[PDB]
Each structure stands twice: as C-alpha cells, then as structure tokens.
Design an enzyme around this catalytic site. Structure first.
Site, short mmCIF file in Angstrom:
data_model
loop_
_atom_site.label_atom_id
_atom_site.label_comp_id
_atom_site.label_asym_id
_atom_site.label_seq_id
_atom_site.Cartn_x
_atom_site.Cartn_y
_atom_site.Cartn_z
N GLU A 18 16.17 15.29 -7.52
CA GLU A 18 15.44 16.03 -8.54
C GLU A 18 13.96 15.69 -8.55
O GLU A 18 13.29 15.82 -9.58
CB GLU A 18 16.05 15.79 -9.93
N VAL B 255 1.35 -10.91 3.31
CA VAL B 255 1.68 -11.97 2.37
C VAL B 255 2.49 -13.05 3.06
O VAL B 255 3.51 -12.78 3.70
CB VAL B 255 2.43 -11.40 1.16
N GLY C 39 0.82 -1.19 0.00
CA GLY C 39 0.00 0.00 0.00
C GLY C 39 0.86 1.25 0.00
O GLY C 39 1.83 1.33 -0.76
N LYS D 276 5.77 24.62 -4.76
CA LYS D 276 7.18 24.46 -5.10
C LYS D 276 7.42 25.08 -6.47
O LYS D 276 6.78 24.69 -7.45
CB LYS D 276 7.58 22.98 -5.12
N1 LIG Z 1 10.53 17.61 -17.78
C1 LIG Z 1 10.64 17.67 -16.30
C2 LIG Z 1 12.13 17.58 -15.82
C3 LIG Z 1 12.33 17.62 -14.31
C4 LIG Z 1 12.37 16.51 -13.46
N2 LIG Z 1 12.57 16.92 -12.13
C5 LIG Z 1 12.65 18.31 -12.08
C6 LIG Z 1 12.84 19.18 -10.98
C7 LIG Z 1 12.88 20.55 -11.27
BR1 LIG Z 1 13.14 21.80 -9.77
C8 LIG Z 1 12.74 21.07 -12.56
C9 LIG Z 1 12.55 20.18 -13.64
C10 LIG Z 1 12.50 18.78 -13.43
C11 LIG Z 1 10.01 19.04 -15.81
O1 LIG Z 1 10.50 20.12 -16.29
O2 LIG Z 1 9.05 19.05 -14.96
#
Ligand SMILES: N[C@@H](Cc1c[nH]c2cc(Br)ccc12)C(=O)O
Ligand SMILES: N[C@@H](Cc1c[nH]c2cc(Br)ccc12)C(=O)O
EC number: 1.14.19.9
Lengths: 528, 528
Positions: free
Chosen positions: B357, B197, B13, B79
């Site tokens: 990222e 499980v 979940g 954000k």
């Molecule tokens: N194509 C995605 C690329 C991306 C992944 N993680 C991100 C994080 C940031 Br802050 C800016 C862009 C991205 C976007 O611009 O939303």
C-alpha cells in the site's frame, strides 16, 4: 429482525424532550415515538450554560433558527467562563481578591488558539513568560475575549455581525417546554402523563413493556431512559451498575436558587462565573433580569446548613425566606450506557458538576452517537458496544478535565482544597499533564479554524478537549511547563515573527473594546 | 546535560538518510550542525517506488521544493491508484487479469475520500443497493470516478495543467536520494562524510557518546538518527533494542525484483501501480519513463528463491539465467521502541512492511514530522520519547493490520500460501474493525470528505490515515461485505432516494473525463 418501529422514552425532563426532538427529527415518518412523563414537584430555574455546538449540532439538526428558540426561552449570551478566587485563600465572596497587583480571575474562552509555524500560540506565550520577556497572563495574551469581557461587551455588533464564538445562558425549563411543543406539534411525538408502576422484562433480559400507575401498558422495540438520577430502566429494571467516581471528584451536593438582577443599573455579564468557595464552587449564570446561582460543594467537608449559610451570605440572601433547591447528585457513569434494548440518555447515564457546561452537551452528543449506531430489532452487539465506548470516553475525558480544576488549584486554606491534592489523577490525565510539563500541546486541534471545529460535530467530537482548553485552565490556575518547548530554540524566525501574532490580538482587543456595544444594549434590541 | 541539541549525526544514507538530512536541515536551519555518515555499498537496480499524495504537501512542500522541480530531476511518472489483479481467482502468476463474473478480475484502490450523503459515506448507500439487488456494479466503479479513466490510461492532469483527481508519483528511489543529497548538502549546509562505522561508544546512561569510523575519525553528537536500514547499526546493534518479528500476521519475507525496458510510444503508460497476485505472494508493477519496475514479494515458507525467480521471470518472459535480478530478504515488523535514549531510528531500521500500500517512503517523513514535533533538548525528557514511540507504534501496527487484511480476506484457496493466510489470526484492533464493518458501520470515517483539507493538513490525515474509503476499497474489492445494510438507512427514505443523483454525478464525471482527458503518455511527452 426488522427495523425499529416503536420507541418509548421514559422521563420528560430536559434530556427527555431533547431525545424526543432529536429522534423524532432523525427518524421522521419511520418510527412511532411516545414519551412517558409523570408530574413531579417543580423546581426553580437555576440556569444552564452551554457550548457553541448547541446550535450547530442540535438546533440546526432540528431546523430551528437561533433567533426562534432564543426569544421563546429568554436566553442570554455566553462568551467564556470567569474563574474567580481559585488562586487566593479566603471566604466565599463574589468579589475577586487581589493577586499580584490584580484581580484573582482568569478566563476560559471559546475558540481555538492560533497556530504560528505549526505551533499553538500558547507555546510562544510561555516561552516569553519563562524567559521574563512578559508577565501578561495566558488568557489576556492569546485571547481577545478577556478584554471585552471585562467591559461586558456583546459578542455581536448592533448590525448582528458576530465577533467571537459564543454560547447561551437560559432556564432549562423553558427550553424543555419549547422542545416539548416542537416534538409534539411538529414531529408527532405522543406525550403521556403517567407514572411508571412496573417494568416487565422477557427471558433475554430486555424490556418487554412498561405499565403505568393507571394500568396502561406501553410496549416498544427500543426504550430510552431519561428518568434522571433514579435510572428507572437502566439501573432499576436492567440492574446495570452505576460506577461512582468520587475518587476523582469530591463534589456531590448543591444548593441553588435564582436571584433578581437589575440589568439597567449593572448591565449583563457575557460569561458564566465559577466562584471558588471554601468547600466547593458557586456558579453564576446571568439571564434576562435575573441570574441563576448554585453552590456545588462536597458533603464530606461541609454540611447542608454550612453550605446554605455560605451560599446565602455571599449573595446577601435570607436563608429563611429565599427559595432554595437542595440537591444530592451521583457523580460518575453507568458501567454501560446502553444495555439490551434500553439506552440511557441524560443524568440517567452519567453526571458531573457543571463546571465546564457539559450537561446539555452530553444529551445531544449521546443522541448523535445513538443515531450513528442505531440498531434494528436484532440489536447487533457491535453497535451497542461501540456506543458504550463513545459514551465512556466522552464522560471520562470530561471527568479528568474537571478534576484538574481542583487538583491544580494553589489554594490550601480549607480541608476541601487540601484534600483535592491528595486524590490521584487518572492514568490518561496524568499522561496529559506529563506532556504539558514537557512543553507539548495536549490534543492540539487539527486546524485553528473555529468554523470547521464548531461546524463539524465529528471534527469536534474527536477533539472535544483540545490544547486551547487545557492551557486556559492549567495556565490560569498557575500550572506551567517546566521549560519552553525545545523546538522553539531551533525556530529563531518563528519566535521573532510571532510578535505580530500577539500584536494582532492586542489590536483586536483595543478595536472591539472601543466599538462593541454592551451585552445589555444588544439584548434590548434583540429581545424586542 | 541541558541546553538545546547542538550536533546531530545521521548514520546511513540512501533514501531514509537523505530524507532525514533534508527535513531536519530545513526544520532546524541555522540552529543545529548535521553530519551524515555514509559508506559506499554495492548499488542495486531501480525497481521503482510508489507514493501517496501527502509526499508533496508534507515533505517537498516543507522543504520548499515545487512538484515540477523534483519530478523532472527524478524522471517521475504519475500514480492515480493501485490495481489489484487476480486476487479473487485461482491460477498461476500472470500479468493478465483472469475472468470474474463476466469481467476482468481487478479492482482499484484510489486516492481521495468517499463523498458524504446526509452524513453517511457513499459506501453505505452502494452496499444498500447491492444487498437489495438494486445494483450489480462493483464498489470502486460505483463510488469512484477514477476506475473508468484508469482503464483507458488517462492522465490525472489535462494538457493545460489542470488536475482532475488526487494522484501520487512513481520514481526510482536512487534518483530522489541523489536529488535530496544535493539539496541537503548544497542548500541546507549538511555535511556528508564517506566512511564506515567501526565502533559505537555508549556512556553509563546507555546513550550513544560518539561513533568511530573505519578511518579512525570520531563523530560525537547530541542526537543520533539511525538510517542504516535493516542492519540497525545503532538502534539494534549498539542500543540492543529488540526487534518485534510479526510473521504471525504477514507471511511474506522475501522478494525478487528487476527493471524492464518499456516502449511508452507503442503501449502508453499506466497511471497506476499494479499489485498482481501470485501463487506464493504478489508482484508489483511501477511504471516509469521508458521502463517499469517489478518485484515478486513472496513467502520463503511456501516458495524457494529459485521457485520465486522462476515464477517471476516466467510471468514477464525473462531469462532467469541472464536477467539482472535483486534478491532481497527483509525483516517484517518493527523495533520495540523506535527511539531509545538519544538514538532515533528512521526508515527500515525502525520498521518494515511489504510495499503493498505504498507506505515505505511515507513512514520516513511521517516519523520525521513526529520527531520534530517531539524534538528534545539535551535533557532528553522521557515524555517526548515515549509519545514519539507511541505514534510510530500506532502508525506501523495500523498499517500491518491493513496489509494482512489483503491476504486474510482474499477468497483464493488454490495454493498453500493463500490457504495458510486464512489460518492466521487478525490483531484485536483489526478484528474489532472487521466487526464494525460487518455491522454496517464505517471504519475510521473521515471528519470531512474534502480531500484538500485531508491531503493539505498532515495532522488531519495522520489522525485518520486509514479511513473508511480505504477499507471499503480493499475489503469490498476482495469480496468482504457487511452482513446487512446499515440499519440507519431504513429510517432515511428520502436520503436513500436522493442518493441516486450522487451516483449519477460519478457516472457523468466518468463519461466526461474519459472523453476529454489525454492519455498519461500524451501528458508526459509535453511535460518531460
Ligand atoms: N490517508 C492515506 C491512506 C493510504 C495509504 N496508502 C494508500 C495507497 C492508496 Br492507492 C490509496 C490510499 C492510501 C491516503 O489516502 O493517501
Ligand atoms: N470543544 C468544546 C470544549 C468545551 C467544553 N466546555 C467548554 C466551556 C468553555 Br468556557 C470553552 C470550551 C469548552 C468547545 O470548544 O466548545
């Protein structure tokens, strides 16, 4: 170091003057361009077919309106390619044979298949066809063009409004002369009438200069080979190997001519015809008062005399008096399109039979990639390698697509059509067919907006052969998935609301058929 | 073994499990019975999650859930970018930006796409001026309007609701999981079963036959979705699919995280995620309502758990003996195949990479999008599975390469961690991208600079997820710049001169938005 100052283009054909015009426009006032052209024995205007991005990616880049170059080149309109007799056995004839209560033909039109609930319309069509809910062919069900093309309708109304995506039919020689005048008179390109005598290279293998038969020496920082199949620079001088790809394409020869046509009596066809033959296929490119035609055949299955006889008999021409062009081309591409300071453009780089009107596209598509990867005097290897990568993918994808036309034809009556089935598809092409058989789309377009597609060369170049093109050819020839897309069984509302999508095509088919003028009628008002 | 999928079992979940239940429940509504197996685990603190703009357009819009609806029920914040702090200067792990070239050591990675000027991204024009000493402004402040308004904690929306920039969201994952749990069960008819499980039964074909729980209940299905997290109860334990460890590209494998109360009235709310470089890793800061989540992602090879806890607590002035802490040891990499037989892995059971990222949640609904696109029937056509595995494999590996570049190209050398990162090797795909970057080329340049098309069409974005704008923000932000300007700019004197107005437009938007936008705290007060 330093920027490119002088550029020498060797060869003054169609590709040569497209390079001079494109590079002259792109680098205007920042590079001296000289074109070396030797007088050759002229040939007949056998006709050229194009694709919609010719205007948006080439003539728009030069700043030349469509009406300007159309009128000076006596061009006609192209809405699709009509594949005739590709599914029925028999001799080479211009008349479509009977197949399942109808003529043996299917269309490959421009544009993109409409999306319905994120799925291309092709998947909805086959789902109905597979379960016996329809017997209409793919092209007539999903495209509005086939109905108006059967009546030779014009892609534009008399008021000029365009009702479909279209391309052009013209004599390449006229466009070359138009671009020759444009490049020399507007862009300051220097034209030199001389024959290449000797190419001098330096210790690094790069071209130092080109000496002509009259003793004149031409030096440059970047050399563009537009010398055609001879490859005076890329192949002869640079010694770059040419990769023959006759293991995918059997056609290597052609017999072509130009035939007068009575547009007043029969009208003008707004499409190119690809007429299947016994050992190849014959094109028909309608123009103003005439049409160009050429029998592309394989020398391994038909001698030149057999092809000339087949070609003339289908058009009722005299093989002893009709002016004919007998050609033996090289099918494939160079190992690298760009080596050192020598960039190959046109048939000096690659060539494939004009089954899908890619000849001229290859020129300005390569010129577009050349400018994007344009180097300085240092000739950064990363720029050259990436350019060579784009060119090889551009051609290899087209090669695989062209082979599918013959590989998936149901004809088995001649050794030619039987041998095509004995060849092997490329791994990339075989994977695409595997996806197709599984009900998946092949390179589905990111959007069904044709204006974005044909208006953004980057958008189109990344998705040149899209799902619409593959379904037109594969389903047209008879290749269909093993079963409908499994996700459609989970979309009862989508398969039910899709009734209005097919009905919209039927309404546009009926409305355009009743209101559009004929192409001949529009061409008369257009060309004065 | 034919027919459509009738029963689907989701094992696991949390966020991934209930994102799969909601997406599959909506896509296959009324055509598949979905049951989710969930065992009670020891709950953890809400350490915060960062997202990307397509979370609304590709996930919640697909479910039919307005942004305001799920935001209010999950207490989410906004954000606008990621602020990389102290990635270029040596020193201890601190929340305060160090001094660099007369300014704070930080740079922004914003959303959106760089504007095109004469078919060339603005980044190429910026570096051309910087290389020739015509400017000293950093890349992000010159080409993006966000950095100026982010320095003042401005809101991405005006008080009247109008949005002035592309933004994402900050929230506690647990609240979104509960929101989707209620949505899936109450609106989409998904069955929730609280059980653990015990045994997974496979057949002679290697496919999962059924799953038996600790209470003796046996759950059979046609397709199984593994959402069990790092444990991989189905894909790894049952199916025995190998996991590809990628510690040769990413050294971070552990994390210490917590949640800190915050007085938004006294200090305001930052409209961005912070990525604070540490001595043996980095620390995130995800501002939320009345609190912010923070976590120190570190490498066990260069810092022990006690050293990381001490570094983490000291930077936030927390008591290492009393502060509630979550100590995590993740597996970095991906499965050899995300989908094997009738078992599809979704979430961290499929792959994982540090949230540098904000790709964690994206991987879930991006895979769910590819799962529906490649949805099978009972025959389990291998082409659908193979193509799905390729899309997932490219999605992660491209992210892995991009994440590694954050550490590989950092100029820091003060600790063994940062020195070792330079001793790793980049993947061939990433090294080729860096070769292009140094050659002045763009890396995966967007087909269009229209962010609405980009973020509004998941297919358009998925094919160009890491585009030139993203690469320049990180690479130029860290200090990696091309060896020389793009050679194509030297042939465009009018373009390099008219680009002055493009940079001036960014400056005008920076000044105007700074004076008219309210603070994020001001907007959050009226909204919530
Ligand atoms: N194509 C995605 C690329 C991306 C992944 N993680 C991100 C994080 C940031 Br802050 C800016 C862009 C991205 C976007 O611009 O939303
Ligand atoms: N993207 C190209 C693909 C293409 C190449 N040759 C064609 C020929 C026809 Br008829 C239709 C489409 C194409 C187009 O849609 O025009």
């Amino acid at each position: 170091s330093g920027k490119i100052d002088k550029i020498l283009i060797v060869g003054g054909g169609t590709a040569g003057w497209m390079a001079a015009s494109y590079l002259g426009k792109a680098l205007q006032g920042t590079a001296d361009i000289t074109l070396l052209q030797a007088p050759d024995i002229p040939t007949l205007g056998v006709g050229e077919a194009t694709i919609p991005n010719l205007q948006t990616a080439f003539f728009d880049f030069l700043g030349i309106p469509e009406d300007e170059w159309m009128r000076e080149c006596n061009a006609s309109y192209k809405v699709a390619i009509k594949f005739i007799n590709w599914r029925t056995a028999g001799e080479g004839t211009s008349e479509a044979r009977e197949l399942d209560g109808g003529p043996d033909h299917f269309y490959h039109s421009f544009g993109l298949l409409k999306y319905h609930e994120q799925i291309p319309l092709s998947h909805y069509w086959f789902d109905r066809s597979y379960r016996g809910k329809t017997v209409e062919p793919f092209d007539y069900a999903c495209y509005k063009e086939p109905v108006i093309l059967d009546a030779n309708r014009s892609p534009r109304r008399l008021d000029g409004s365009k009702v479909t995506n279209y391309a052009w039919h013209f004599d390449a020689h006229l466009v070359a002369d138009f671009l020759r005048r444009f490049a020399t008179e507007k862009l300051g390109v220097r034209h030199v009438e001389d024959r290449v005598e000797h190419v001098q290279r330096d210790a690094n293998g790069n071209i130092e200069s080109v000496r002509t038969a009259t003793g004149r020496v031409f030096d440059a920082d970047l050399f563009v080979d537009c010398s055609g199949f001879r490859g005076l620079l890329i192949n002869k001088a640079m010694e770059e190997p040419f990769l023959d790809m006759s293991d995918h394409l059997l056609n290597d020869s052609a017999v072509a001519t130009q035939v007068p046509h009575d547009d007043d009596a029969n009208g003008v066809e707004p499409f190119t015809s690809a007429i299947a033959m016994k050992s190849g296929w014959t094109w028909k490119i309608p123009m103003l008062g005439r049409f160009g035609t050429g029998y592309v055949y394989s020398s391994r299955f038909a001698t030149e005399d057999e092809a000339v006889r087949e070609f003339c008999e289908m058009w009722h021409l005299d093989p002893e008096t009709q002016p004919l062009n007998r050609i033996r081309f090289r099918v494939g591409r160079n190992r690298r399109a760009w080596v050192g300071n020598c960039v190959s453009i046109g048939t000096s780089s690659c060539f494939v039979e004009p089954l899908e009107s890619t000849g001229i596209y290859f020129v300005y598509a390569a010129l577009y990639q050349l400018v994007k990867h344009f180097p300085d005097k240092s000739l950064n290897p990363v720029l050259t390698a990436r350019f060579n990568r784009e060119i090889e993918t551009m051609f290899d994808d087209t090669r695989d697509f062209i082979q599918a036309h013959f590989y998936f034809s149901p004809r088995t009556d001649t050794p030619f059509w039987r041998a095509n089935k004995e060849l092997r598809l490329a791994d990339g092409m075989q994977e695409k067919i595997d996806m197709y058989r599984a009900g998946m789309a092949i390179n589905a377009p990111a959007s069904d907006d044709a204006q974005l597609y044909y208006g953004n060369f980057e958008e189109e170049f990344r998705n040149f052969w899209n799902n619409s093109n593959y379904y037109c050819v594969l389903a047209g020839l008879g290749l269909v998935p093993d079963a409908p897309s499994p996700r459609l069984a989970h979309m009862p509302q989508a398969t039910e609301s899709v009734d209005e999508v097919f009905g919209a095509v039927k309404d546009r088919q009926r409305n355009l058929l009743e209101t559009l003028p004929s192409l001949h009628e529009f061409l008369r008002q257009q060309h004065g």
